[PDB]
């Protein structure tokens, strides 16, 4: 769900 994937 953050920027840098997958999140």
């Given at each position: 769900g953050l920027y840098?994937?997958?999140d």
């Open positions: 840098p994937y997958p």
